[PDB]
Amino acid sequence: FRKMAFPSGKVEGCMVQVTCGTTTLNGLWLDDVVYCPRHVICTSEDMLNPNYEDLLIRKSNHNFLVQAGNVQLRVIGHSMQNCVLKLKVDTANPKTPKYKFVRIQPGQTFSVLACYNGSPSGVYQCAMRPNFTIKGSFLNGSCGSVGFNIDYDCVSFCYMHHMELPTGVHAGTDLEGNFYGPFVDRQTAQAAGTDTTITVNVLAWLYAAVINGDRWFLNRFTTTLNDFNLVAMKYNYEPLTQDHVDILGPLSAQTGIAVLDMCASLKELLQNGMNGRTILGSALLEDEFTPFDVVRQCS
Amino acid sequence: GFRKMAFPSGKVEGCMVQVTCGTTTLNGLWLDDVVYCPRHVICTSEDMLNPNYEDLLIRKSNHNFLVQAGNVQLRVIGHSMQNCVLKLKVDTANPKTPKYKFVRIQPGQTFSVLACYNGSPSGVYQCAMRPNFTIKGSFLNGSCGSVGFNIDYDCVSFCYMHHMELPTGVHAGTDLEGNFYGPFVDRQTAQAAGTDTTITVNVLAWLYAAVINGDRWFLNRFTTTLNDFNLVAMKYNYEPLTQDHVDILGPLSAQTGIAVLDMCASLKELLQNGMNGRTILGSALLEDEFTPFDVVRQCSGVT
């Protein structure tokens, strides 16, 4: 049972490089539009305190250098949508997949295609944390890298990368340019709210451990949903809803372990610790697999 | 804070096809005008219990092989067996063929796996070849013929093709010349993974990654010789280091100023006493599936 990303090829064909002045990052080329973070228009000094509408009105189409591989694409229009710049180009991307833009919920997962200078570097799976950060792997020049899910050859883009917080976690926007979380695209110290653990995901992963032959953490105790949620909240876990209980249905049916019985297992894990033992090779309780991720990999 | 990162899979996605004989369907790799796939595609389920591959291949002709890119059939114009892989010559050169090499990897080396079903890629993840020549993969029915690979400057180095799952849940397969990693055979008969060991060179790479990020409490004031370290390491079920291992740690040793043998002595102390209550890179366990290249790959912005 591995952290598994979606195949990245459909997104690789959309990555380009965008340069304004001496600022270079990545863009997403779909049909005849390139989407990228608006701070590409900032000088280093601008980034410390940008007025973006004031900065953008001072730019012309020819200030944007867009490169697809070695070929330059001519920008013939530009507009700003929240924190995303949309560059209209005179060329349509023949590799444009069927796609949608979606805004994801905390706890949901997606694949990231990390890119530099318009070229793909690596692919990995992330979760939107409850505090709306992501624990990514991004370096200088990674901005405009995107996160996505793939469903029957349709790519749902959900994340575009903008920044790294001082704790090392990452922040960005949806493809409409709206940040996840209380962050702004200004170079200034920013903290996130206190994070919490994605309870429904921990339960899905505990089911993954049972599907793969590991059961040491199970017990005969029992819990109600409300009594479990009281303990979960005490340990900085997110509440478990009836909707979550229902989504876990297929995993409980496959394993014959009632959802509330797995809740009692997790309650014991939280109250006693793991005693130096491991679950699926992990010393900590993993919360970045959704129920759907577990089903997709185990079935 | 240091996670597994797969290579972008697009160059390999463009090479995946499906291969069917009878009702047995698996994945194949289409490069130029040849499709490579596991030879047990020619077996019925009953054949797999005790196959005579040479005799089974005698009874097959080109017209018995259904090769499809999606729903599009590729006409087979020749077939041959090379160890445990079948090579089907087709009448169309794949226009998506990347620059590529076939390589046989060492234990400890990592690669990306593109898990595929019915020729359709489903997911991508990183794997290490264990010292017992298994991989801790994630594979379901129909996954055979999925490949593992590394990329270096637009050249895809294919190193693994998937064939089978062992009773402990780990996986075994071949290089792209059809030679198994490890003592395994492509027959549905009782087989077992041997005892595994910890990949020392990768643990050292992980300790260097910790040092790069300022996590260096475990740096001691001692050193060791390679031979003394190798003999102690084996007592803790750690792999001995080769001369090649020492050299592939060279770049990380230069970056940090920590000599390889000094880091070996630091690791020895962890094995004999260490951790206590402390963590390294936020982990109480020593990670052994990051190579020195993987550390450098993720700390640089390669490609």
Ligand SMILES: CC(C)(C)[C@H](NC(=O)C(F)(F)F)C(=O)N1C[C@H]2[C@@H]([C@H]1C(=O)N[C@H](C=N)C[C@@H]1CCNC1=O)C2(C)C
């Ligand atoms: C890291 C840092 C001190 C620099 C800064 N962060 C904060 O100022 C914060 F703390 F508010 F987040 C920061 O990220 N930026 C400052 C400036 C852009 C952004 C930025 O350089 N983005 C990079 C895009 N190519 C990706 C980064 C690079 C390192 N790893 C990443 O992911 C804008 C917010 C306009």
Ligand SMILES: CC(C)(C)[C@H](NC(=O)C(F)(F)F)C(=O)N1C[C@H]2[C@@H]([C@H]1C(=O)N[C@H](C=N)C[C@@H]1CCNC1=O)C2(C)C
């Ligand atoms: C696990 C099973 C008991 C079925 C058997 N294993 C052993 O006989 C062993 F234990 F000896 F290894 C086994 O894998 N096979 C039996 C038969 C082929 C192979 C096989 O079905 N390969 C699948 C390719 N599509 C991938 C498998 C499916 C489940 N997960 C996988 O990865 C051959 C060895 C010729």
